[PDB]
Ligand binder design. Structure first.
Ligand SMILES: CO[C@@H](/C=C/O[C@@]1(C)Oc2c(C)c(O)c3c(c2C1=O)C(=O)C(/C=N/N1CCN(C)CC1)=C(O)C3=O)[C@@H](C)[C@@H](OC(C)=O)[C@H](C)[C@H](O)[C@H](C)[C@@H](O)[C@@H](C)/C=C/C=C(\C)C(N)=O
Ligand SMILES: CO[C@@H](/C=C/O[C@@]1(C)Oc2c(C)c(O)c3c(c2C1=O)C(=O)C(/C=N/N1CCN(C)CC1)=C(O)C3=O)[C@@H](C)[C@@H](OC(C)=O)[C@H](C)[C@H](O)[C@H](C)[C@@H](O)[C@@H](C)/C=C/C=C(\C)C(N)=O
Ligand SMILES: Cc1cc2nc3c(=O)[nH]c(=O)nc-3n(C[C@H](O)[C@H](O)[C@H](O)COP(=O)(O)OP(=O)(O)OC[C@H]3O[C@@H](n4cnc5c(N)ncnc54)[C@H](O)[C@@H]3O)c2cc1C
Ligand SMILES: Cc1cc2nc3c(=O)[nH]c(=O)nc-3n(C[C@H](O)[C@H](O)[C@H](O)COP(=O)(O)OP(=O)(O)OC[C@H]3O[C@@H](n4cnc5c(N)ncnc54)[C@H](O)[C@@H]3O)c2cc1C
Lengths: 473, 473
């Protein structure tokens, strides 16, 4: 029997499949497209996603297919330096195309035994007290204990669940185009720099093969929401840059809005939502793909705990309680960024003020920590500021903390030489290392790296173990 | 013969008259209203204006008619603490009604020998190579060497000069009302706090005599721009608070827009502009009256230098070069503040972000230093960061720096015990005090307190003296 069906083989579903396969969960990914999408939206990973890959041993292969960058401008394009005091051991951006990211995640989920089934489109679902049935577009049916809708921003699973998707509608539309041009690159760059003095939703990135990635504001809103024709691209280029640069031969044309919507419930019985299926927003700051990977990273071990039969009764609901607010804040900061990109005189004045403010180090650090998600703090109810946050990588006596996390289990980092997780040993590893560069006596880490407890008393630790690791065995 | 005619007896003109009378300038103020306006717009003075009064010995009488406050919320109503590290010796707000401020400034200009003429409205002007003629509404004429339009935001002088007044038109209108209500004050306060959770352009301040100062957003824009009727006040109260509180018996009704305009030239021959005559903007931050007082403080000694015949040929034009950019930045930060008061979802998201940012001390200090004008730096062409800024009050061996400035002349603060201003002694005082709490060897201060030179070489000081104090005598 299949334990979990994943609808959608994007980065969220692929990352989710990897996290489930770490614990033996029989996992089938139903991906509707017959062949992988060759068009990249995302252009890299932010610090928290980079850490997550390192916690799972995948950073080396990601670094081998990407380039590290330490540049500014990630909050509404506000030029700045990279914050020199970012509280991460992975303080950089990893430039890597989403097609490459999906490739690496596909290969890792496969080698762990996840079953990827392409050309399989979920069309219906029927759940009861024991499992979920997925109905494919060809009439075939698949049965599992749980189904997770990782099927993108226009999620079939979300619609079939009737989950409300409230937020702000699209009011600003932008065009996307991979095209060839009739001007030299230096001519394109000169015009772009002139337009970007006021209109920052205009840009051009070469693809290296003679094609150019163009971003250009749309004119009004479209009724069809369909892909723009080449003619529409030329009209918007003329309106924004005064010329269409002789664009021709598009190999990709697209239109995206700035709508911000959030699923009201991440869980409906035995069906859950993750990634763009649970939340949509503009790509300001490059947060969507990171937000989806970290949804799967939060959900994986919890869902595996359910399949394993040791999950506490509130564990699975903690996926919603923790990730729904994180997405709500992402949506809010993209609405703020979009306003800072507005041409209206009011927002322009606020933008100039933000330019003054980001010159202060604690502002620049605060904005980047927001964009890169390294400052996310779940409300776990404890007074300690570290509890609820992810623990950064730290040097041990030999090696580093993240090298001990590749199994996806719990981890008690103990410097007292006195604590014990006896009774939860199959679920929580005991890292007794007084030489660990951490200024707490001990820290209990969930399998997602988030701190669940800090202290030095054994009896205090024993009372905090059952919430995230169930009953002692 | 009259040296200077001042059109308008508001705080700008009254402050200007005081600065001119310090140097014997025969000064006539032509104020159109027969009796002083008893309605206050401003509710106090910010730090730079407070310092300016202390430099002229007027702070004691201002403090005796006002109350000192150290509270937050001066930038777009963003709640915060008063910055604990504000770089002023006068780190507070002086709560004092504008009617009281105008009263104190009227009495001080009079006791210095300025001639205030009420019921005198400037209707025309005619200038030539030798002077200016003011034509009053009753056909009488007055002749002087210079005329300064300090006649408010709808300046007659500005219009007659044909000076362009570019900027942003009014797009947001707000109502003002001194009225009585039919509800207890605690009922008014409860409703106000509920509305101010989203609409921050709504407020109520008691007047102490049973009347209440109401601020309420208007509905759209008015064609007449005339004063709102009581009916219009009730409609806007219902729309914004759901009730009109039983408002009745208005003793003041007003409407103001958010237009931001700036005179293209502060000087036209022998006619200059100052205060609201040179710039209009919303009252966000309470900056207008301070901006006007500091216009007069910049212009006074320069205009007196012209009348005295020792002004360098570029001195009078430096009034525009220094004050026009200062006003432009005030206008810009009020457009930013208005956006932060917008109800639209975009600006609301940016406001929440600003609320996060102002918790950082250097942000809170930066915004308040902007509002209170203590960080204004004129571009005097020198590399030293202090040059162009006003020097804060500092302790001397005995007393403080500002006590030596009441004559409105130049001041060389010398700690080397070696420098000399011989040749400019009638215009620049020599404060030789090695015990002065200032970490420069010496600083040359203009009569407005702004630093013109810093160093220790006598020959370097002699080359900088003529620019602001003319030829040696
Ligand atoms: C025309 O390009 C702009 C687009 C603005 O409009 C939005 C709404 O559309 C986007 C589209 C279509 C994107 O693909 C990305 C981003 C945005 C937008 O804000 C975006 O903001 C962002 C992160 N920042 C996305 O990584 C994006 O991929 C932005 C991509 C640019 O300027 C603005 C206004 O933010 C961009 C952030 C700046 O050029 C900025 C200096 C970047 O180049 C800096 C931070 C380097 C980033 C790293 C890169 C590119 C890398 N991994 O190689
Ligand atoms: C309803 O009241 C508000 C009005 C907002 O709209 C604007 C456009 O209209 C004004 C009108 C009609 C004013 O008279 C003043 C100010 C504004 C506005 O922004 C204003 O912003 C300000 C300074 N800040 C003006 O001192 C004003 O006198 C503001 C007065 C308030 O809230 C907002 C949104 O900024 C106000 C600044 C806050 O209540 C704030 C906490 C103040 O009370 C704090 C800073 C104390 C100030 C000192 C006072 C009142 C004193 N001297 O006693
Ligand atoms: C222009 C642009 C630029 C962006 N730039 C960045 C960036 O720089 N950084 C960043 O982090 N993010 C960025 N994003 C966002 C990022 O691309 C998305 O958030 C990311 O793809 C989300 O992954 P996902 O797996 O949730 O969903 P998706 O990638 O949408 O994939 C879901 C999968 O479900 C499949 N599917 C759909 N329906 C069904 C069905 N019924 N049955 C089975 N399978 C189905 C789809 O074929 C697809 O493969 C950008 C987005 C855009 C539009
Ligand atoms: C609601 C509101 C709240 C405000 N709150 C604050 C605040 O908290 N802090 C702050 O600093 N500022 C505030 N301001 C702004 C401040 O009130 C003005 O900037 C200030 O009055 C400017 O002074 P002024 O002397 O230039 O001009 P004004 O005060 O306008 O006075 C000019 C004078 O010229 C006279 N006059 C006009 N035409 C003629 C003519 N033809 N001949 C002769 N005389 C003439 C007028 O009668 C008047 O007395 C506020 C403004 C408003 C509307």
């Amino acid at each position: 029997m299949i334990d979990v069906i994943i609808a959608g083989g994007g980065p969220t579903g692929l990352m989710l499949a990897g996290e489930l396969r770490l614990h033996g969960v029989r996992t089938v990914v139903l991906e509707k497209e017959p062949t992988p999408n060759q068009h990249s939206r995302s252009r890299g990973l932010h610090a928290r996603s980079i850490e997550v890959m390192d916690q799972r041993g995948l950073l080396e292969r990601f670094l081998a297919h990407g380039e590290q960058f330490r540049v500014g401008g990630f909050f509404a394009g506000l030029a700045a330096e990279w914050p020199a005091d970012l509280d991460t051991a992975h303080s950089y951006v990893l430039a890597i195309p989403q097609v490459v990211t999906e490739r690496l995640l596909t290969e890792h989920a496969t080698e762990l035994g996840a079953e990827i089934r392409r050309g399989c489109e979920v069309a219906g679902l029927d759940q009861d007290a024991d499992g979920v049935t997925a109905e494919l577009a060809d009439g075939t049916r698949l049965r599992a204990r749980y189904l997770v809708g990782c099927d993108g921003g226009r999620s079939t699973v979300r619609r079939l669940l009737g989950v409300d998707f409230p937020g702000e509608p699209t009011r600003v539309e932008t065009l996307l185009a991979d095209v060839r041009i009739d001007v030299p690159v230096e001519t394109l760059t000169a015009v772009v720099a002139e337009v970007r003095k006021t209109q920052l939703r205009f840009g051009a990135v070469p693809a290296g093969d003679g094609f150019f990635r163009l971003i250009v504001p749309a004119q009004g809103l479209s009724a069809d929401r369909a892909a723009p024709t080449l003619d529409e691209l030329k009209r918007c280029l003329h309106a924004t840059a005064g010329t269409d640069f002789g664009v021709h031969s598009p190999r990709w044309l697209s239109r995206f809005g700035d709508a911000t919507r959030l699923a009201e419930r991440y869980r409906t019985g035995r069906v859950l939502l993750a990634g763009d299926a649970a939340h949509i927003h503009p790509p300001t700051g490059g947060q969507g793909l990171n937000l989806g990977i970290q949804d799967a990273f939060n959900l994986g071990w919890k869902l595996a705990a359910a399949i394993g039969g040791w999950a506490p009764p509130d564990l699975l609901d903690s996926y919603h309680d923790e990730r729904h607010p994180v997405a709500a804040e992402v949506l809010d900061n993209t609405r703020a960024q979009m306003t800072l990109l507005s041409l209206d005189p009011g927002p322009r004045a606020v933008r100039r003020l933000m330019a003054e403010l980001v010159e202060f180090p604690d502002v620049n650090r605060h904005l980047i920590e927001k964009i890169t998600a390294i400052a996310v703090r779940y409300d776990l109810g404890d007074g300690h500021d570290l509890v609820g946050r992810r623990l950064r990588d730290i040097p041990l006596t030999e090696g580093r903390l993240y090298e001990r996390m590749r199994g996806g289990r719990g981890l008690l980092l103990d410097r007292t030489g006195r604590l014990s997780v006896s009774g939860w040993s199959d679920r929580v590893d005991h890292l007794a290392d007084p030489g660990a560069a951490l200024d707490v006596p001990a820290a209990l880490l969930r399998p997602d790296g988030h701190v669940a407890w800090v202290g030095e008393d054994q009896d205090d630790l024993l009372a905090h173990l059952p919430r995230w690791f169930g009953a002692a065995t």
